Amino acid sequence: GTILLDLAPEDKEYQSVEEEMQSTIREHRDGGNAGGIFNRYNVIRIQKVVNKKLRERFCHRQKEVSEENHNHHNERMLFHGSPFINAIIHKGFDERHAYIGGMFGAGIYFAENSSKSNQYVYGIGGGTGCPTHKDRSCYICHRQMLFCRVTLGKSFLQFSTMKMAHAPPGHHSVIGRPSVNGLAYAEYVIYRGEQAYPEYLITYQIMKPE
Numbered sequence: 001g002t003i004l005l006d007l008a009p010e011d012k013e014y015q016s017v018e019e020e021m022q023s024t025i026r027e028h029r030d031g032g033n034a035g036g037i038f039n040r041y042n043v044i045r046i047q048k049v050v051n052k053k054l055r056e057r058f059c060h061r062q063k064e065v066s067e068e069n070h071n072h073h074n075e076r077m078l079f080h081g082s083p084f085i086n087a088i089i090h091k092g093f094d095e096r097h098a099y100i101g102g103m104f105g106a107g108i109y110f111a112e113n114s115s116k117s118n119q120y121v122y123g124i125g126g127g128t129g130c131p132t133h134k135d136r137s138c139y140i141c142h143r144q145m146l147f148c149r150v151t152l153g154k155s156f157l158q159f160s161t162m163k164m165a166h167a168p169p170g171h172h173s174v175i176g177r178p179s180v181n182g183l184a185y186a187e188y189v190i191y192r193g194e195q196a197y198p199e200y201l202i203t204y205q206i207m208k209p210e
């Protein structure tokens, strides 16, 4: 099944993942309600997720999308937060567990800003926060998020809600782009689980500003 490989803090691969996570934190329009209030994370550990069957399914679909899209699979490294990340690292991404209430319908959603995915680590809108203290801004409990390879192929660009069950005809993903009277941060949506691989598992705490 799945094996987790510990990355060393002195390794450039660990450093690259932490820097993308830290540098993409943003202030969210909800006043921190969903993910808490913070300007930096304390990274506890970063692990590489290794799984032969999951990697084969992801690579097979990536070759298929590349062939359909002028040899451009358009893979992007994106964050994903979910209360079910344990099932994702062992069984892979699955469109059968889509975010039904998402702005683009029943897809699997990713963000280029780590703090946007942090709003979903404890559920939609942050749920009831950490299991132990029921605090969406808990500074004690260790959180987990994924930094994923996501095959986008030909993306359908949108600025506002457009609910759908599957990708638009001729396309492989939907991108919600930021705009003045619209989204603050981008969101990326796929409708097939084999279009994402949970490359890195990050364990962290949000830090209290001071």
Ligand SMILES: Cc1ccc2n1CC(c1ccc(C(C)(C)O)cc1)=NC2=O
Binding pocket: 079, 080, 081, 082, 083, 084, 097, 098, 099, 100, 102, 109, 110, 111, 116, 117, 118, 120, 123, 124, 187
């Ligand atoms: C809209 C958006 C941008 C970035 C993310 N999202 C949603 C989201 C997510 C994950 C899981 C779920 C359930 C259905 C609870 O599994 C719901 C939502 N995770 C994210 O990383």
Ligand SMILES: [Zn+2]
Binding pocket: 130, 131, 132, 133, 134, 135, 138, 139, 140, 141
């Ligand atoms: Zn807690």
